[PDB]
Amino acid sequence: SVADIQQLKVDESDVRIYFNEKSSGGKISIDNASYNARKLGLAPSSIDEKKIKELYGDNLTYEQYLEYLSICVHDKDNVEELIKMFAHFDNNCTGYLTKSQMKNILTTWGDALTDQEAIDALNAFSSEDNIDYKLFCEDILQ
Amino acid sequence: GSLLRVQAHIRKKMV
Ligand SMILES: NCCSCc1ccc(C=O)o1
């Protein structure tokens, strides 16, 4: 209600239908809410999930889920912040990180991916060992 | 920080 529901960029019919696909007893789990956010093209982190859990627990009513989705819009996101994070690790200044170097970063810190998730994501992007991380960040943001 | 945004967009893409 106080949330930015109007602004939520997403087809509202999909928002509802995705909720009905995953809801049980009128509520949707956080895991399924984040899944739906992703299907709608939003990118929640653990910070977003923690915020909504702190407010409402593990199972959200429809209204609460709408509020969760509005938390997930991340208008501030840009490619520069993503590139700069990887550039931290590019100490020899090549413009590339290997798949192993990328796998290590993505699986060791933050909202760590599993080895298989990282590997699958990197393999989906490129068949070569050297990854242009600028192009990778451009790809994931869209 | 940034890292989380990177991981978030990868999870989005792989869905
Ligand atoms: N599970 C991550 C919660 S906050 C820790 C963290 C790691 C990296 C960042 C931001 O890039 O934030």
Numbering used by the authors:
A (entry chain A): 61 to 68, 71 to 204
B (entry chain B): 802 to 816
Paper text:
The CSPs of 8 localized to the MTIP CTD including several contiguous MTIP–myoA hotspots, for example, Leu 168, Trp 171, Gly 172, Asp 173, Ala 174, and Thr 176 that form the loop connecting helices α6 and α7, involved in the key intramolecular clamp with Ser 108. Taken together, these results suggest that the primary amine linked to the furan via a thioether represent key features of 8. Three different myoA tail sequences were prepared (terminating at Leu 805, Leu 804, and Ser 803); by analysis of residue-specific CSPs caused by the fragment and the crystal structure of the wild-type complex with PfmyoA(799–818), it was rationalized that these positions should provide enough space for the fragment to adopt a binding conformation.
This PPI is thought to be central to the malaria parasite’s ability to glide and invade host cells in a defined, directional manner, as correct localization of the myoA motor protein depends on its interaction with MTIP (called myosin light chain 1, MLC1, in other apicomplexan parasites such as Toxoplasma gondii). We and others have developed peptidic inhibitors of the PfMTIP–myoA complex by mimicking the C-terminal tail of myoA, which adopts a helical conformation and is “clamped” by two domains of MTIP (N- and C-terminal domains, NTD and CTD), burying >2000 Å2 of solvent-exposed protein surface upon complex formation. We have taken a different approach by studying isotopically labeled PfMTIPΔ60 (containing both MTIP domains) in solution using multidimensional NMR techniques, and recently reported assignments of the 1H,15N-HSQC spectra of both the “free” and “bound” states, along with a detailed analysis of the conformational dynamics and thermodynamics of the system. It was found that the free protein is highly flexible on a range of timescales from millisecond to sub-nanosecond exchange processes, which may explain the difficulty in crystallizing the protein in isolation.
